[PDB]
Structure 1
Amino acid sequence: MEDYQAAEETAFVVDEVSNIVKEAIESAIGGNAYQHSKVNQWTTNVVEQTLSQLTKLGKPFKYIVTCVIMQKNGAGLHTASSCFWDSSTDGSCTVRWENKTMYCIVSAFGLSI
C-alpha cells in the first residue's frame, strides 16, 4: 500500500496538471476578449502560473509549458507532438480551451529527473 502511495506521489498525474492548466488559463485569460496587446501578457501569466503550480506539487519533474492563444477567424488549428522518453515515469498533458473569439492550447510536459 505504501509503494502505491509513493508511486502516485512520484508519478506525473495527468488530471492534476490539466486542472492546473485550467486554473492558470482562467486566472490569466478569463472572459476577456482577444486583443493583440494583451496576448503576450496572457501567455506569460499562463505559463508562469502553470510552472509555479507544477513546482509546488513537489514532484521531481522538470516541467515544460508551452502556450498558444488564437484569434477565431475560421482558420483551423492543429497542434501535434510525438516525443521519446521513458513512458513509465515521464508524462505529457495537452489541453484545449476556447471562448467565442479565442482558442488556447497549453502543453505541459513533466520529465523525471
Structure 2
Amino acid sequence: VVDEVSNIVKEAIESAIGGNAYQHSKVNQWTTNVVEQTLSQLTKLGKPFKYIVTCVIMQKNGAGLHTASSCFWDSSTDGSCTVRWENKTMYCIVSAFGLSI
C-alpha cells in the first residue's frame, strides 16, 4: 500500500530525525537509520515484496533535488513509493520500493 508506505516513512522520519537539523558527520547515519526503519516496517508486515528503501538527505543551502523512482515492476502487482519530507535545514527525499515475489 502506497499510503501505508508513506505513513511508515513519515513515522520513521519523525522518530529518527523529526526536528533534527543536518550535520555532515550524521547525515549518512540518519539516512541509514531511516532506511533501516523503513525496511523493518516493510518486512514486519509479512507482505511477499522484495522491499527496497532508499534514503537521500540534502542540506538546505540553496540546492534543489529532483526525486523520482521508476522500476521495471508490474502495474497491477507492484510499485514504488518516493516521497519528500522537509525540515528547517535538512532536505530529505527518500524512496521506498516493493516488487511482487
Report deviation, 1:82.
2.8
The answer to whether structure 1 residue 40 and structure 2 residue 53 are counterparts is no
- For 1:50 and 1:82, the matched residues in 2 are separated by 18
Give the aligned CA root-mean-square deviation in angstroms: 1.0
Cα-to-partner distance string for 1:1-59 (whole Å, 9 max, x where unaligned): xxxxxxxxxxxx10000011011111111111111011121011100000001011111
Q: Find the partner of 2:83 among 88, 95, 108.
A: 95
- For 1:84 and 1:60, the matched residues in 2 are separated by 17
User: Does the CA contact (< 8 Å) of 2:83 and 2:94 recur in 1?
Assistant: yes
Rg bigger for which structure? 1
Cα-to-partner distance string for 1:55-110 (whole Å, 9 max, x where unaligned): 11111000001111110011121123332221110111111001111111111111
Q: Alignment identity in percent? A: 100
Residue ranges of structure 1 left out of the alignment (5+ in a row): 1-12
User: Does the CA contact (< 8 Å) of 2:69 and 2:82 recur in 1?
Assistant: no
Normalised to the residue count of structure 1, the TM-score between the two structures is 0.84
Residue ranges of structure 2 left out of the alignment (5+ in a row): none
SS of corresponding position for 1:36: coil
- For 2:13 and 2:84, the matched residues in 1 are separated by 10
